């Protein structure tokens, strides 16, 4: 009778919308978890709608859908690519069991009750490449999505990328820089000069805050706070003052980098994406811009 049972389980497992490659290797429990969560997903999708190696591969992050009690009803495949952890390993389980607690309250606040959500969370990563969950590491995800009614969170979890280990090319409109924990410039490359007008030599003593438009300081504050607590951030769009009048728009991804043999923090590395040209050229904002 369990003959019939086990065999029907596996049969079931097979044509869930997944390869028998993975369908094959399931404990009945997983088949359940996944069955249900698959149904729930099709429902919620019906709730919102009233060949895809493209969308999967085009993405440099994955899709999570997570209930209000925190159970992750659905997760896109390529999560394994970014997190190591497979969809199979995860659907149905509590988000809180795979996230750095200390991030849990904040996760709870973005889980409930504008529906736009934008926050950073640390998640368990097990990737050279693959390890096991024993020595798992904390990976920061930028998560952006919408919450929905039930209550329900649909987010895209984008990894921030670690500057020493790139996978994408970089542009001419992108410069790179190093800071103390103070965000004092300690280093900057010589793309600055062409991009905003400073010699790198000039910025060494200087904290980064000297160069933000006042209108952006607090937002930056938020980023800093987060960079430190979590270890990485992507900042919003913000203006940096240029060598003479006016400013250019920017977006900076910051990563705390660690001494490998010391396991202490070292500096902050910043991939700084310049998003514009000097906007106001006529207008002078700070003391340095007045010289000459």
């Amino acid at each position: 009778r369990r003959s019939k049972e086990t065999e029907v389980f596996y049969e079931l497992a097979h044509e869930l919308p997944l390869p028998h490659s993975v369908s094959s290797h399931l404990d009945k429990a997983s088949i359940m978890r996944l069955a249900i969560s698959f149904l729930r997903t099709h429902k919620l999708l019906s709730s919102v709608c009233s060949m895809d190696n493209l969308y999967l591969k085009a993405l440099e992050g994955f899709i999570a859908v997570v209930t209000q009690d925190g159970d992750m009803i659905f997760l896109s495949e390529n999560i394994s690519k970014f997190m190591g952890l497979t969809q199979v390993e995860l659907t149905g389980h509590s988000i809180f069991d795979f996230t750095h607690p200390c991030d849990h309250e904040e996760i709870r606040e973005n889980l409930t009750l504008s529906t736009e959500r934008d926050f950073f969370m640390r998640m368990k990563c097990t990737v050279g490449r693959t390890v096991n969950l024993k020595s798992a590491t904390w990976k920061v995800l930028h998560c952006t999505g919408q919450v929905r009614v039930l209550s329900c969170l649909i987010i895209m979890c984008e990894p921030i990328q670690h500057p020493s280990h790139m996978d994408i090319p970089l542009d001419s409109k992108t410069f790179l820089s190093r800071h103390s924990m103070d965000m004092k410039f300690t280093y900057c490359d010589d793309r600055i000069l062409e991009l905003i007008g400073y010699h790198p030599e000039e910025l060494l003593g200087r904290s980064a805050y000297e160069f933000y438009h006042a209108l952006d300081s607090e937002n930056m504050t938020k980023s800093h706070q987060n960079l430190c607590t979590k270890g990485q951030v992507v900042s919003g769009q913000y203006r940096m003052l240029a060598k003479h009048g006016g400013y250019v728009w920017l977006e900076t991804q910051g990563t705390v980098i660690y001494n490998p043999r010391n396991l202490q923090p070292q500096c902050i590395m910043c991939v700084n994406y310049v998003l514009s040209e000097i906007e106001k050229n006529d207008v002078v904002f700070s003391m340095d811009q007045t010289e000459s």
Binding site: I168, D171, M287
Partner: protein
């Protein structure tokens, strides 16, 4: 050892009830039958709805562009809710045509001699910041595009009161070009009478770190006219060290 059993049974209930043509029964069937029921039903039933999943969480849309011409090979209809743009417009078109003029060089370099990602302003002369994330494939780019996001004037000072920053509105507010305040201490534009009032005010903002304080005084306009002004300000402390970066004021004509 056996609460395995009771959420296997929880599984069988919970599962059983979202299969409709099974939910529709007064009596609810056995193990295998609920299982094969779900099976055959699933068979009866992850593709473009994925696309809208993208549109809902990320506010994004798919597009393929030839690395050759920059001409748009394909654009997902999700472009329309994102960019307020007809698929029409993006099919006879080149992606260079769809961005900000200043964003062109960047684009030339993302389409040059793997995997790609960048930020650029795309038109809906009105542009929005868009993050495109994709990869190269047989010679093309398959990527996804994603969205997100006078009475007075603001200034910043070092603790001594030297102007270290003014917003351009200063010129309208007090008649001065930024150049004429920047570098000079704020108490110099102050009526001698109110100077102590200004000084002590700085004390209070620094002694008490983080909260805001207001002060009213006469400020020397560029036509040399004493202007009652309220300025209200607080210190800005580094998030890591909590020592004092500088003071932020807002100066509002009264």
């Amino acid at each position: 050892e056996r609460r395995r059993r009771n959420k296997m049974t929880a599984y069988i209930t919970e599962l059983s009830d979202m299969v409709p043509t099974c939910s529709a029964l007064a009596r609810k069937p056995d193990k295998l039958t609920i299982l094969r029921m779900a099976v055959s039903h699933m068979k009866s039933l992850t593709d473009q709805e994925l696309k809208h999943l993208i549109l809902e969480a990320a506010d994004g849309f798919l597009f393929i562009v030839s690395c050759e011409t920059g001409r748009v090979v394909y654009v997902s209809d999700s472009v329309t809710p994102v960019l307020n743009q007809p698929q029409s417009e993006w099919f006879g078109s080149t992606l260079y045509d769809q961005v900000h003029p200043d964003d062109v060089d960047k684009l030339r370099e993302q389409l040059s001699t793997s995997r790609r990602s960048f930020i650029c302003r795309m038109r809906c002369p009105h542009f929005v910041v868009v993050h495109c994330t994709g990869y190269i494939k047989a010679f093309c780019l398959v990527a996804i595009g994603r969205l997100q996001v006078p009475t007075e004037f603001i200034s910043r000072h070092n603790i001594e009161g030297i102007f270290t920053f003014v917003d351009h509105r200063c010129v309208a507010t007090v008649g001065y070009q930024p150049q004429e305040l920047l570098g000079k201490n704020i108490v110099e534009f102050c009526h001698p009478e109110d100077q102590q009032l200004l000084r002590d005010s700085f004390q209070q903002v620094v002694k008490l770190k983080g909260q805001v304080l207001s002060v009213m005084f006469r400020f020397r306009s560029k036509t040399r006219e004493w202007l009652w002004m309220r300025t209200s300000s607080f210190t800005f402390q580094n998030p890591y060290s909590d020592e004092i970066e500088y003071i932020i004021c807002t100066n509002t004509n009264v």
